[PDB]
Amino acid sequence: DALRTLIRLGSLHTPMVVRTAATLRLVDHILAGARTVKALAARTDTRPEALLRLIRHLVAIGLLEEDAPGEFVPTEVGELLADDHPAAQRAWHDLTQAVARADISFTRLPDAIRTGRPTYESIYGKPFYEDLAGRPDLRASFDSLMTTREDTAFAAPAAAYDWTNVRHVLDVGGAPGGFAAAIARRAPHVSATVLEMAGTVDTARSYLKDEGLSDRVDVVEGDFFEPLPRKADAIILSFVLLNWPDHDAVRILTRCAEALEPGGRILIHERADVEGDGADRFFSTLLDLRMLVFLGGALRTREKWDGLAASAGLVVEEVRGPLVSPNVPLDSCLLVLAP
Amino acid sequence: IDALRTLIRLGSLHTPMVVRTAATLRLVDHILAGARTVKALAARTDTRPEALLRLIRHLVAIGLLEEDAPGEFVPTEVGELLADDHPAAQRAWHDLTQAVARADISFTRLPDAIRTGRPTYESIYGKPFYEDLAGRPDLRASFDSLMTTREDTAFAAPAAAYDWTNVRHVLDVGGAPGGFAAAIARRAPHVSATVLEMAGTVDTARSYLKDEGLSDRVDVVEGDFFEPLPRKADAIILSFVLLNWPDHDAVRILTRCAEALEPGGRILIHERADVEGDGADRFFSTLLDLRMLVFLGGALRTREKWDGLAASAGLVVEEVRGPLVSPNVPLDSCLLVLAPA
Ligand SMILES: CC[C@@]1(O)C[C@H](O)c2c(cc3c(c2O)C(=O)c2c(O)cccc2C3=O)[C@H]1C(=O)OC
Ligand SMILES: CC[C@@]1(O)C[C@H](O)c2c(cc3c(c2O)C(=O)c2c(O)cccc2C3=O)[C@H]1C(=O)OC
């Protein structure tokens, strides 16, 4: 009972079985004809006796079901492992792609709790970003995973802010540019600038080009720690401050405050857990612990945000309620920061 | 969507690694010894306090810890199983510095085990499983410790599932510490027993039986069970031995046992024998089977697979004795009685 619950919680074979099914494109090969284990083994280049033992666990956890003897089809949850599903969960669990490869850092979590520093380098030889720049195949798969989420996740944050009295918007860490794209559709009178670093600056140009927004959202390069090149009535920090330590985040916040036009606002799009609420913490701590072992960053509660804001001459005006997006598991918040 | 959260939870590595880190840090033991605040726990575990609190946050979410009083954390009923003195020994079984949990890192390369059917332990640690233990005394001793705790209780029910009245001598191939032989001696004082075991791991046998007060009537012989067995016996026992080996090697050990079988004797296999369609619990069975694959290239075998191996060794499965329930042991076992065909 309690012995069963503890063993299930500390089991490594179940999450590795799921990641193996995704890496082998198992669900894809089933939908495309391969019904028997003999055909599934041939298409995945695996030994049939071993694949059946993996399927046996996949059946026991509800990702596959036996429909007629020997024929295995995916369940409704197992259908998410199809490569063309909108949630892209197969790519997120592919051990050859960036995120699931990086999740191996969790096998050294005791070191991360001892030091507070990431363990990615201790497994792959280089830190997270240096390894991406040296493996273009991995940098591409990471850029892809970010773009699949950015194409839909910003309609709700865009709707949670009034843009009538806004002239220009600067998105620091503009990423692919999905947020700036969502602001353009919501408020066509606003001009947007995506400010990115030397690396991601060109993944933003190509994304807004393919959206038909090249003439509507400018993309400039820059460094977040130097003075900002332009002023804006609204500066956006969407999932950027969680990558930097505390002493570097107040600098980015200070530069934003400095470049903030009169009456403007700084918008922080991230999590802001409150100790009292009964909100789901599963996805939040997943992201938080990922930040620890990947880069050393961290999430921040609403109380810590007040400390960061006050240190940048800013004040947290208001946290706009839970932002829900169709295929985005983690609900987010919008923080409004005034001087 | 509920399916999106169900799939992400099943495929998550942060939850099981948080449990193993808590076990490795002896977190629950330090709480029960006075340290309830984070600053006290960080001092006793030699960790960074801000990082420790983030690990505690996941532990309370998954119900292993609870925040009774502000800033003070206490283990739940499930969390109390990570205390080191707990009879199930789950803290040692999740300790990343000890043999079993260290070997579970082999799961990170499970796709290679499905492509080749051979273990992945060597690709993580440089040497195969047993060769790595024989070379790291700290690890072999921790491995011996995990088995010995289980061998102290898991053999009363299997011993009671067999009639020893007409048995004169019992040979236990792969006799482990010697728990099965110790359970038979207490149940049938008229039985002499010999424990057979390979190099290095015979050392754990003589001291366990001595500490059981049975050093008199349980012999211990060092040998290799791919060679002719040291003697004949009315009952030859294979308690969780064959699952460590592939099919061709298991048939050879089975063939050596059939060669040393006295007239009228029986070979007893103590392991699992699931029947496809039984509908019995398969959480503990799949874990052990997949562990055997990545650890050593072994496997569990179904009732039908057992019929094939027995026939290849000149044997027939006469009886399969029902689910054996042993205290603090999550996996019910079985006793297959084999006779010459
Ligand atoms: C380097 C790592 C990185 O920071 C990359 C990038 O910064 C990013 C991450 C996380 C999230 C979002 C990001 O853009 C994001 O936009 C978002 C959102 O709109 C709505 C809900 C959750 C999220 C969310 O959890 C981080 C990550 O772990 O990616 C695998
Ligand atoms: C590496 C160690 C080894 O492969 C071989 C080792 O001998 C052994 C194992 C497993 C079991 C028993 C063992 O003795 C055992 O006695 C037993 C029992 O009496 C009653 C129920 C279950 C079990 C059981 O699952 C394997 C293992 O991986 O440990 C979990």
Residue numbers in the entry:
A (entry chain B): 15 to 353
B (entry chain A): 14 to 354
Sentences from the paper on this structure:
DnrK is a canonical S-adenosyl-L-methionine (SAM)-dependent methyltransferase that catalyzes 4-O-methylation in daunorubicin biosynthesis.
Both DnrK RTTD and DnrK RTTR became exceptional generalist enzymes, with the ability to use any of the substrates to catalyze reactions, yielding all potential products albeit at different yields. The presence of R1 from RdmB in both chimeras shifted the reactivity from 4-O-methylation towards 10-hydroxylation, with less than 15% of the native DnrK activity measured, compared to almost 60% 10-hydroxylation conversion. Structures of DnrK RTTD and DnrK RTTR in complex with 1 revealed the molecular basis for the expanded substrate specificity. Regions R2 and R3 are observed in a closer interaction with each other when compared with all structures in complex with 2, closing the active site to stabilize the smaller aglycone substrate. This structural change allows stabilization of the substrate via hydrogen bonding interactions between R163 and the 6-hydroxyl group of 1. As an example, DnrK RTTD and RTTR differ only in one amino acid, K190 and N190, respectively, that is located in R4.
